[PDB]
Design a protein around this ligand. Structure first.
Ligand SMILES: O=C(O)c1ccc(-c2c[nH]c3ncc(-c4ccccc4)cc23)cc1C1CCCC1
Length: 267
């Protein structure tokens, strides 16, 4: 281990888009935390950052039981490393895709309900997450999920983010974002698409559009019809919900307030 003020830093527990997350013991309050560690110089060289202080500003806005909680930032202006202490969500990611053990419909519904609550909250606070996927959804001791990894999240003003391009994990990126043609698209509808991909993963253990070849992956996202396998056989109302979330037209894609009242969600 190593010491950092009142914190004993221990094993690496995860690695998100940026930096690493360590288990950390706080000797002052005898409690464990999760600590994200970033190198300022390394982030600079990755650019070829004020983005980090934007992530911090966003996380300081958020207080919701289905979202991770930032508790402290340790940032010495004469040190390379920045440290963000979060509350520990001890059971870790809900799922890593691909997996041989998908969730049952009932368990998927439970976690999807948590995800809806977290996302509506984010969007109410004018945050788009932009990297919704099962490996970013952490299960707490209480059995509920918390949305994590705000490293590519964005704050907008007004009613929606007007994006000309976006950052995300390719398999979870909506078709409107993968065009080779200058455009503008809704930030919120991107998160919905990714929620759809995530729900599909929950019950099938794989993404609905996949290819090892990035160009074919993009092509499938934009132009391949959504298909469900023969097993596991899932309810028709769940197929309907996923089908509406993975509407390739963001203009007609189902929106969060409608997802919450969808019959699959409310049963
Ligand atoms: O990179 C990030 O911005 C980031 C920041 C904080 C956490 C986090 C806050 N509390 C936590 N409790 C637990 C765990 C955890 C535990 C076990 C296994 C994996 C993760 C992670 C966390 C997680 C991340 C990402 C990297 C791993 C998944 C998302």
């Amino acid at each position: 281990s190593m010491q950092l003020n009142q914190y004993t830093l221990k094993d690496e527990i995860g690695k998100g888009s940026y930096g690493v997350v360590k288990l950390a013991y706080n000797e002052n309050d005898n409690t464990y935390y999760a600590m994200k560690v970033l190198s300022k110089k390394k982030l600079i060289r990755q650019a070829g950052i004020e983005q980090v202080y934007q992530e911090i500003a966003i996380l300081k806005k958020l207080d919701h039981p289905n979202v991770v909680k930032l508790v402290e930032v340790l940032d010495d202006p004469n040190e390379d490393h920045l440290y963000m202490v979060f509350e520990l969500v001890n059971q870790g990611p809900v799922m890593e895709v691909p997996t041989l053990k998908p969730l049952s419909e009932d368990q998927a519904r439970f976690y999807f309900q948590d995800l809806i609550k977290g996302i509506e909250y984010l969007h109410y606070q004018k945050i788009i997450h932009r990297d919704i996927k099962p490996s970013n959804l952490l299960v707490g001791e209480d059995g509920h999920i918390k949305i994590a990894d705000f490293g590519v999240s964005n704050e907008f003003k007004g009613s929606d983010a007007l994006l000309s391009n976006t950052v995300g994990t390719p398999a979870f990126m909506a078709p409107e974002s993968l065009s080779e043609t200058r455009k503008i698209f809704s930030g919120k509808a991107l998160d919905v698409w990714a929620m759809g991909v995530t729900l599909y993963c929950f019950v099938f253990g794989q993404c609905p559009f996949m290819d090892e070849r990035i160009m074919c992956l993009h092509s499938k996202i934009k132009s391949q019809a959504l298909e469900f396998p023969d097993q596991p056989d899932i309810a028709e109302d769940l197929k309907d919900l996923i089908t509406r979330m993975l509407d390739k037209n963001p203009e007609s894609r189902i929106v969060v307030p409608e997802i919450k009242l969808h019959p699959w969600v409310t049963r």
